[PDB]
Design a protein around this motif. Sequence first.
Motif, PDB file in Angstrom:
ATOM      1  N   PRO A 160       0.693  -1.162  -0.164  1.00 43.22           N
ATOM      2  CA  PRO A 160       0.017   0.069  -0.160  1.00 43.22           C
ATOM      3  C   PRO A 160       0.741   1.081  -0.025  1.00 43.22           C
ATOM      4  N   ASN A 161       1.986   1.437   0.496  1.00 42.30           N
ATOM      5  CA  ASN A 161       2.785   2.396   0.250  1.00 42.30           C
ATOM      6  C   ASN A 161       4.103   2.183  -0.982  1.00 42.30           C
ATOM      7  N   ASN A 162       3.379   1.748  -1.917  1.00 42.94           N
ATOM      8  CA  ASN A 162       4.185   1.674  -3.416  1.00 42.94           C
ATOM      9  C   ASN A 162       3.993   3.242  -3.942  1.00 42.94           C
ATOM     10  N   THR A 163       4.679   2.927  -5.025  1.00 45.92           N
ATOM     11  CA  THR A 163       4.650   4.156  -5.923  1.00 45.92           C
ATOM     12  C   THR A 163       3.307   4.590  -6.416  1.00 45.92           C
ATOM     13  N   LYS A 164       2.399   3.825  -6.992  1.00 49.87           N
ATOM     14  CA  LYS A 164       1.132   4.190  -7.670  1.00 49.87           C
ATOM     15  C   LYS A 164       0.018   4.622  -6.341  1.00 49.87           C
ATOM     16  N   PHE A 165       0.206   4.228  -5.105  1.00 50.73           N
ATOM     17  CA  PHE A 165      -0.584   4.562  -4.237  1.00 50.73           C
ATOM     18  C   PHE A 165      -0.171   5.791  -3.278  1.00 50.73           C
ATOM     19  N   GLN A 166       1.160   6.077  -3.160  1.00 48.54           N
ATOM     20  CA  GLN A 166       1.702   7.507  -2.691  1.00 48.54           C
ATOM     21  C   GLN A 166       1.434   8.568  -3.606  1.00 48.54           C
ATOM     22  N   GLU A 167       1.290   8.325  -4.831  1.00 50.61           N
ATOM     23  CA  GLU A 167       0.727   9.378  -5.888  1.00 50.61           C
ATOM     24  C   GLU A 167      -0.770   9.518  -5.863  1.00 50.61           C
ATOM     25  N   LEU A 168      -1.773   8.245  -5.524  1.00 52.74           N
ATOM     26  CA  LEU A 168      -3.139   8.446  -5.337  1.00 52.74           C
ATOM     27  C   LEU A 168      -3.239   9.247  -3.996  1.00 52.74           C
ATOM     28  N   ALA A 169      -2.505   8.924  -2.815  1.00 52.50           N
ATOM     29  CA  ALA A 169      -2.681   9.916  -1.714  1.00 52.50           C
ATOM     30  C   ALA A 169      -2.395  11.230  -1.787  1.00 52.50           C
ATOM     31  N   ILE A 229     -12.413   1.342  -9.487  1.00 50.43           N
ATOM     32  CA  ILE A 229     -11.984   0.674  -8.128  1.00 50.43           C
ATOM     33  C   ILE A 229     -12.178   1.891  -7.254  1.00 50.43           C
ATOM     34  N   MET A 230     -12.495   1.522  -5.990  1.00 54.77           N
ATOM     35  CA  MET A 230     -12.797   2.281  -5.000  1.00 54.77           C
ATOM     36  C   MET A 230     -11.776   2.205  -3.802  1.00 54.77           C
ATOM     37  N   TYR A 231     -10.670   3.212  -3.517  1.00 55.38           N
ATOM     38  CA  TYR A 231      -9.665   3.111  -2.887  1.00 55.38           C
ATOM     39  C   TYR A 231      -9.927   3.935  -1.417  1.00 55.38           C
ATOM     40  N   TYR A 232      -9.776   2.970  -0.229  1.00 53.04           N
ATOM     41  CA  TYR A 232      -9.667   3.520   0.970  1.00 53.04           C
ATOM     42  C   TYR A 232      -8.491   3.412   1.624  1.00 53.04           C
ATOM     43  N   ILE A 233      -7.741   4.419   1.603  1.00 57.40           N
ATOM     44  CA  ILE A 233      -6.365   4.507   1.981  1.00 57.40           C
ATOM     45  C   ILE A 233      -6.210   5.380   3.140  1.00 57.40           C
ATOM     46  N   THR A 234      -5.542   4.782   4.250  1.00 57.78           N
ATOM     47  CA  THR A 234      -5.244   5.163   5.515  1.00 57.78           C
ATOM     48  C   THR A 234      -3.678   5.805   5.556  1.00 57.78           C
ATOM     49  N   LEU A 235      -3.395   6.846   5.847  1.00 59.45           N
ATOM     50  CA  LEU A 235      -2.185   7.616   5.652  1.00 59.45           C
ATOM     51  C   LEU A 235      -1.989   8.609   6.746  1.00 59.45           C
ATOM     52  N   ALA A 236      -0.510   8.993   6.921  1.00 60.14           N
ATOM     53  CA  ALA A 236      -0.026   9.950   7.783  1.00 60.14           C
ATOM     54  C   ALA A 236       0.173  11.325   7.020  1.00 60.14           C
ATOM     55  N   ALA A 237      -0.315  12.457   7.474  1.00 57.94           N
ATOM     56  CA  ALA A 237      -0.003  13.518   7.133  1.00 57.94           C
ATOM     57  C   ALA A 237       0.586  14.451   8.188  1.00 57.94           C
ATOM     58  N   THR A 238       1.471  15.493   7.880  1.00 61.84           N
ATOM     59  CA  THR A 238       1.723  16.659   8.775  1.00 61.84           C
ATOM     60  C   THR A 238       0.978  17.852   8.644  1.00 61.84           C
ATOM     61  N   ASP A 239       0.362  18.615   9.831  1.00 58.61           N
ATOM     62  CA  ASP A 239      -0.256  19.583   9.796  1.00 58.61           C
ATOM     63  C   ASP A 239       0.479  20.813  10.502  1.00 58.61           C
ATOM     64  N   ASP A 240       0.963  21.736   9.536  1.00 62.52           N
ATOM     65  CA  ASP A 240       1.695  22.534   9.569  1.00 62.52           C
ATOM     66  C   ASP A 240       1.999  23.680  10.623  1.00 62.52           C
ATOM     67  N   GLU A 256      -9.025   4.006 -14.300  1.00 62.90           N
ATOM     68  CA  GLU A 256      -7.492   3.919 -14.956  1.00 62.90           C
ATOM     69  C   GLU A 256      -7.308   4.294 -16.373  1.00 62.90           C
ATOM     70  N   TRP A 257      -8.267   3.658 -17.245  1.00 60.88           N
ATOM     71  CA  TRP A 257      -8.729   3.367 -18.609  1.00 60.88           C
ATOM     72  C   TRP A 257      -9.111   4.785 -19.131  1.00 60.88           C
ATOM     73  N   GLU A 258      -9.748   5.578 -18.064  1.00 59.47           N
ATOM     74  CA  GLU A 258     -10.115   6.604 -18.857  1.00 59.47           C
ATOM     75  C   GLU A 258      -9.673   8.138 -18.054  1.00 59.47           C
ATOM     76  N   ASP A 259      -8.332   7.731 -17.349  1.00 58.71           N
ATOM     77  CA  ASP A 259      -7.593   8.360 -16.310  1.00 58.71           C
ATOM     78  C   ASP A 259      -8.243   9.287 -15.652  1.00 58.71           C
ATOM     79  N   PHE A 260      -9.185   8.736 -14.821  1.00 57.19           N
ATOM     80  CA  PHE A 260     -10.103   9.400 -13.932  1.00 57.19           C
ATOM     81  C   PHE A 260      -9.590   9.262 -12.582  1.00 57.19           C
TER      82      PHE A 260
END
Length: 87
Positions: A8-17, A48-59, A74-78
């Motif tokens: 889940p912290n691969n290339t594609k997913f880090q760019e989706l988040a 596909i519906m992606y439920y990503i749980t992630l860490a972010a910092t608030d400034d 994917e196919w309609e780059d949506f």
Amino acid sequence: GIVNVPNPNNTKFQELARFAIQDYNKKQNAHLEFVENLNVKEQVVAGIMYYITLAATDDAGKKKIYKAKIWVKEWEDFKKVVEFKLV
């Protein structure tokens, strides 16, 4: 049905988040910074519906756990953030 994504912290997913955090900062006039995904789950819908749980910092660089639900065809780059909140 939601199922676990094994890398889940691969290339594609880090760019989706990073895209959702950028959707969020633009629409909220906020300054969150993605650090890392913690978990990704997925459901087959009209795409596909992606439920990503992630860490972010608030400034102040304070870390918080967030969850984004992003709809992608994917196919309609949506990409579309359907939801974004604290967990």
